[model samples]
Target: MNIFEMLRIDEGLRLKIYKDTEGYYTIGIGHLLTKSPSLNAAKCELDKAIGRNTNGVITKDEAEKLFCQDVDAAVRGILRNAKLKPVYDSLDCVRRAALINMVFQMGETGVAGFCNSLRMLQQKRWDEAAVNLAKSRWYNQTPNRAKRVITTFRTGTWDAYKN
Candidate 1:
């Protein structure tokens, strides 16, 4: 079964799925709550699942394991759920995924603070968006990482960021 099917994530679960064929369980960021042996086993299963699904599209299985099936749902809910409309709007899948990945690493406040940058993106103001994206505390904290993401968004080519 596909990752979604294996996880039984129809509407999408806001958690990663790890399975050993018999059943599946959920995981979250930073290996938080994954200390239990069963949870660790689930993480191992998820690593394998990502290897199988991405077909090496991604190689850092541990990092990949952090991605939840409901990423899209979480992003949509965050961007379009009315309550957050003042901060964001529907983003292109690429942009949405990229932003969600950042949020997954940082946290709602960190991601939400990118409202100005997101607005620039919505307006298709590439340069401004890139500038805004690079102006965050994250940019200073993780220059290479932030530069890579901004480059990808601006160029529409993953190669630009060497992703």
Candidate 2:
């Protein structure tokens, strides 16, 4: 039920600069430079992810560091939102990991847009929440990943974990 482990599997890893499905500049386990706190900060990390500073492909250890930072930021961003706290706090560890995954893929603001799903989840209406999640544009964009996450949401199970 480790959120980081689940996300590493779902997001995959990229040691070099590459564009995401939406064409955003991303690297190191789905870390989007466009969404970074500052352009300079983003640039620095981008260089590192590209291994320009190191003059080679980013090492697995470096990628893991970035992964940890990205995952922690996503979790912190999710919990910091006042609107999500009540519902987020009501969930068990498994369900909470599902939320973290959603926030990791889509930013906190994007996940916050799921009003109906959040309501259903807060009420412990698992199936309804899953249906609502499956009915969204996010699901349509990445059906396979969305399917796994939705299943986790509905079942409160670790079936989504690859490791």
Candidate 3:
């Protein structure tokens, strides 16, 4: 089941922003109502569902937990979007990390648009995957700040920012 769909079923949707039982403002899939950008209230509500703090401040623990959940969710999203390609176990941590970051930067649907790219990934071909990225006319992305990811995909190195 889709995690969000299941969450929607269990938590339902709140179209209007309202205070929850704990007096913290919430909306949408129990989203933590963050403070206004300019306002930095010392006190805030911590939503357990997403590990978000409403007051624009989070401890190291909070940040780590949220990033962990984000990575897991993004990986799952990519897996499902890839039609469960079953290539997770086949990828080394660096390759898997690059793919996960790609999925995070561009939504799973975004990555899925590159069906051939994904196939190249499955066959353990590195440059072919990066070449597909280099050939992207839609976004005109190549050797930019995305160099970190593109270079990783191309040559399995992190020093691509030297351009």
Candidate 4:
């Protein structure tokens, strides 16, 4: 399924589209936000980002060409700021999802600032990772999202109520 399908916003939380000062349309999901002309664009960007980073096999040119979306450019911008490969290589799927969620919300540089949290995870110290995860500026800014992703990563199960 697509990432937006995975997110599954209800009517109350359905995305609202608007143009930025730059005239670029973006999608806002409840209080959460993303930049895209449409849901398809968002998914194309996300998929290309994940695929490009998966095995170090795909190049930026290839991902953009294959997806037929400029999201690859945005993803590259994110990767440039975050230097995500080390953390990407280190975490499990759920934990990686948490990182991706963070990147989605805060951009690469913002997520990359969680160096302590990343180190804790790399060391396989779950409790420390959890604590460090909660210690970020992002944690305070988006408590509900931070808690939900962290819980999923720690427990290896998504809480249906929150998700």
Please give, for residues 1-163, the per-residue lDDT of candidate 1 as tens digits: 2222222221223344443212335433222223345755655555665555432223334443444434544565566544334434455645554555565445466566566786777777877889888877778966765776676567644543331
Error of 3 at 38 (Å): 13
Candidate 2 wrong stretches, greater than 4 Å = 35-45, 48-56
Which portions of model 1 show Cα errors greater than 4 Å? 1-66, 69-90, 161-163
C-alpha TM-scores of all predictions: 0.52, 0.86, 0.56, 0.56
**Sliding window of 10 residues with minimal summed lDDT for model 4:** 5-14
Candidate 3: give the clashing pairs: none
Best by TM-score: 2
Global lDDT of each candidate: 0.51, 0.80, 0.54, 0.52
**Separate clash counts for every candidate:** 0, 0, 0, 0
How many clashes does the backbone of model 4 have? 0
TM-score for candidate 4, residues paired by index: 0.56
| lDDT tens readout by residue for model 2, 23-105 | 76677777776754454556676776555664324667777887888888887897899767777899999889889888888
Q: Give a tens-digit lDDT track for model 3, residues 1-163.
A: 2323222333345544455433555454444454443222213434443355444444444444544565677788966764424555566666666676656445577776777877777787887777776666423632353546666666655444332
**How well does candidate 1 score on lDDT at residue 64?**
39
RMSD per candidate (Å) reads: 10.3, 3.4, 11.6, 10.3
